[PDB]
Amino acid sequence: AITLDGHQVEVCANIGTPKDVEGAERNGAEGVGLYRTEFLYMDRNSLPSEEEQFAAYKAVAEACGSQAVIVRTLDIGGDKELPYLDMPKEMNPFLGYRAIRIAMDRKEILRDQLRAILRASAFGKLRIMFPMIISVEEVRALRKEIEIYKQELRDEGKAFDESIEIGVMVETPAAATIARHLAKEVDFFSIGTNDLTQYTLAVDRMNEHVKEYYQPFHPSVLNLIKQVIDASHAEGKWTGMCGELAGDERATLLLLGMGLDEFSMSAISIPRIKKIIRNTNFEDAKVLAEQALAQPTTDELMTLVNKFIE
Amino acid sequence: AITLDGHQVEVCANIGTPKDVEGAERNGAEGVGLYRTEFLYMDRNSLPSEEEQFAAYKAVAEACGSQAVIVRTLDIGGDKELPYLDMPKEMNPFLGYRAIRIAMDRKEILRDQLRAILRASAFGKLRIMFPMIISVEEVRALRKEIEIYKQELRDEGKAFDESIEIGVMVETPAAATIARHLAKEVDFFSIGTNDLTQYTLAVDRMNEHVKEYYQPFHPSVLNLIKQVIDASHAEGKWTGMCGELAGDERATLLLLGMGLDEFSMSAISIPRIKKIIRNTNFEDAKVLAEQALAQPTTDELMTLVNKFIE
Numbered sequence: 001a002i003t004l005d006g007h008q009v010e011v012c013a014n015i016g017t018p019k020d021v022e023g024a025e026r027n028g029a030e031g032v033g034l035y036r037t038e039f040l041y042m043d044r045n046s047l048p049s050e051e052e053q054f055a056a057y058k059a060v061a062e063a064c065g066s067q068a069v070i071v072r073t074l075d076i077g078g079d080k081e082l083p084y085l086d087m088p089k090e091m092n093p094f095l096g097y098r099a100i101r102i103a104m105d106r107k108e109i110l111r112d113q114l115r116a117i118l119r120a121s122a123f124g125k126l127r128i129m130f131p132m133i134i135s136v137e138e139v140r141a142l143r144k145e146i147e148i149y150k151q152e153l154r155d156e157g158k159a160f161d162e163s164i165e166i167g168v169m170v171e172t173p174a175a176a177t178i179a180r181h182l183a184k185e186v187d188f189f190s191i192g193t194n195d196l197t198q199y200t201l202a203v204d205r206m207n208e209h210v211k212e213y214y215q216p217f218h219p220s221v222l223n224l225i226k227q228v229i230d231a232s233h234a235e236g237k238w239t240g241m242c243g244e245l246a247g248d249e250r251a252t253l254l255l256l257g258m259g260l261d262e263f264s265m266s267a268i269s270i271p272r273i274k275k276i277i278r279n280t281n282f283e284d285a286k287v288l289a290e291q292a293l294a295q296p297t298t299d300e301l302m303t304l305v306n307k308f309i310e
Numbered sequence: 311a312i313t314l315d316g317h318q319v320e321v322c323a324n325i326g327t328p329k330d331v332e333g334a335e336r337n338g339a340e341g342v343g344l345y346r347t348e349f350l351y352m353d354r355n356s357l358p359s360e361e362e363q364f365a366a367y368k369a370v371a372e373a374c375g376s377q378a379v380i381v382r383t384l385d386i387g388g389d390k391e392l393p394y395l396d397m398p399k400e401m402n403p404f405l406g407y408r409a410i411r412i413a414m415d416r417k418e419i420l421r422d423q424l425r426a427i428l429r430a431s432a433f434g435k436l437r438i439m440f441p442m443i444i445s446v447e448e449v450r451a452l453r454k455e456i457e458i459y460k461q462e463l464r465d466e467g468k469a470f471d472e473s474i475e476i477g478v479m480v481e482t483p484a485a486a487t488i489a490r491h492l493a494k495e496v497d498f499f500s501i502g503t504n505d506l507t508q509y510t511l512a513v514d515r516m517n518e519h520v521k522e523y524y525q526p527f528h529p530s531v532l533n534l535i536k537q538v539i540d541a542s543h544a545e546g547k548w549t550g551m552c553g554e555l556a557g558d559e560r561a562t563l564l565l566l567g568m569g570l571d572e573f574s575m576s577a578i579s580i581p582r583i584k585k586i587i588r589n590t591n592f593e594d595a596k597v598l599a600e601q602a603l604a605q606p607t608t609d610e611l612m613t614l615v616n617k618f619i620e
């Protein structure tokens with residue numbers, strides 16, 4: 001989509017299973033900004049094989065023609081009950097043995113999924129996105145593993161996209177703070193704003209007694225987002241957002257002004273957000289974003305963006 | 311304590327009960343940078359009355375003579391530790407209904423403790439520090455309540471320090487990010503580094519399966535700390551540290567170079583940290599700190615700090 005003054009941003013669909021692709025196309029998605037892969041690991045008694053995963057990743061790669069699909073690696077933890085995974089009981093599963101920490105400790109899981117994505121990337125434009133990253137050394141280790149797996153596929157005579165792009169799903173405050181360092185190691189970011197908000201404000205939004213503390217428009221969260229966007233641009237990269245905020249019509253102008261390159265959302269929201277983008281002036285939104293992110297409280301920030309919307 | 315080139319920093323004791331003052335004095339504490347108040351709420355079947363808290367706060371205020379004592383308000387949650395409050399079970403208690411969130415929801419708890427601290431402030435130099443802060447709105451709501459309690463004390467004829475100082479214990483990435491706004495409305499910060507590390511890196515340090523992810527020297531944590539320090543200075547305020555890192559001889563020169571104004575620690579660590587401070591050049595430390603905080607990984611940061619030490 002393009003703003004009134006010619007600023008282009010991508011507006012993409014979040015997908016949870018290959019059937020969601022139909023709704024994404026129906027609603028004018030320009031691509032898939034988040035393909036969640038948890039459905040492959042749930043409601044079963046055994047890890048999904050490389051072949052089973054490949055079948056699913058290939059289906060989406062071909063379904064989306066020439067559009068890019070961002071595949072998020074396993075993003076699950078002990079809060080979910082999947083006995084075959086043998087996940088330990090945890091006092092704070094949101095801060096625990098989850099997502100990339102599982103895959104990097106149980107290489108079978110990482111290898112099965114990354115090999116499957118690599119093989120599927122021969123049939124469409126796929127990107128790999130890692131969740132729960134907090135450190136440059138995690139990314140460096142993952143890139144080494146990817147190159148090992150590429151060599152294995154070459155040694156086996158299996159095709160893959162040798163230039164597959166790699167990204168971090170920025171959801172920890174740590175990753176937001178070292179974004180400039182991370183932007184040197186990966187091709188893009190995508191902001192998981194729901195989880196970034198929870199970790200930054202130290203709030204589990206499903207906790208009934210503190211649920212009101214969860215505010216994605218909190219100035220700390222938005223300034224961290226701006227920091228990540230700016231870091232990506234300083235290195236010639238780009239930042240998307242697959243968190244719920246990207247599909248929030250109260251945030252579209254603000255996020256545009258912040259310089260967000262890509263919005264990814266439940267497909268039903270794509271036409272509304274597209275329309276806002278096409279009727280926004282980027283330069284004006286940039287001025288509003290600067291004033292908004294300078295406000296000291298959520299209420300004062302939101303009051304400013306809402307008046308500008310009117 | 312003063313550095314070789316004349317930079318003064320306070321070296322203070324963390325205490326958890328009036329009995330700890332003796333050891334703080336024994337070891338040369340220049341004041342109390344953290345008076346934990348959990349001992350008043352734990353190991354009992356009832357809330358601690360205002361009078362019981364007042365007795366404990368007054369005893370430390372008088373024991374410390376002319377020194378300042380920073381009293382941290384209730385900083386705990388969960389059923390295990392507050393069973394007489396009938397706390398609900400929580401999936402992620404570390405992100406839940408705890409500390410100031412409990413007190414601002416159950417106003418009797420806030421009122422008993424702040425009135426006791428206010429009354430005790432007539433007997434020595436006391437400061438109030440709030441944990442778990444994520445927003446300016448919370449500081450404003452707490453200041454409003456303090457002013458109500460102040461007027462109640464005036465109406466009852468009870469003395470209190472009318473200019474009692476108010477601070478935030480920075481442990482949430484949120485507070486670190488909005489530090490410049492908070493510095494306008496509070497008198498000081500103290501960094502709770504253990505919890506700031508856990509929230510920033512999204513890691514429960516007590517979780518055996520991810521304990522290796524807990525890294526207080528991680529560049530994101532130290533850069534958040536520097537952000538807090540600099541924000542406090544921009545507003546003519548100051549920043550201390552009562553987290554474990556302040557008692558760590560590996561971090562002293564680094565924290566000094568980052569501009570930390572106060573170190574607070576278990577009393578037995580005070581002589582060694584004082585000696586390092588007195589044998590350090592602040593200007594040289596500042597250069598070191600700038601280089602260290604620019605490093606992309608914990609290992610590169612610590613290696614750089616270690617080499618400078620040696």
Ligand SMILES: [Mg+2]
Nearest residue numbers: 131132171195
């Ligand atoms: Mg997450």
Ligand SMILES: [Mg+2]
Nearest residue numbers: 441481502505
């Ligand atoms: Mg804490």
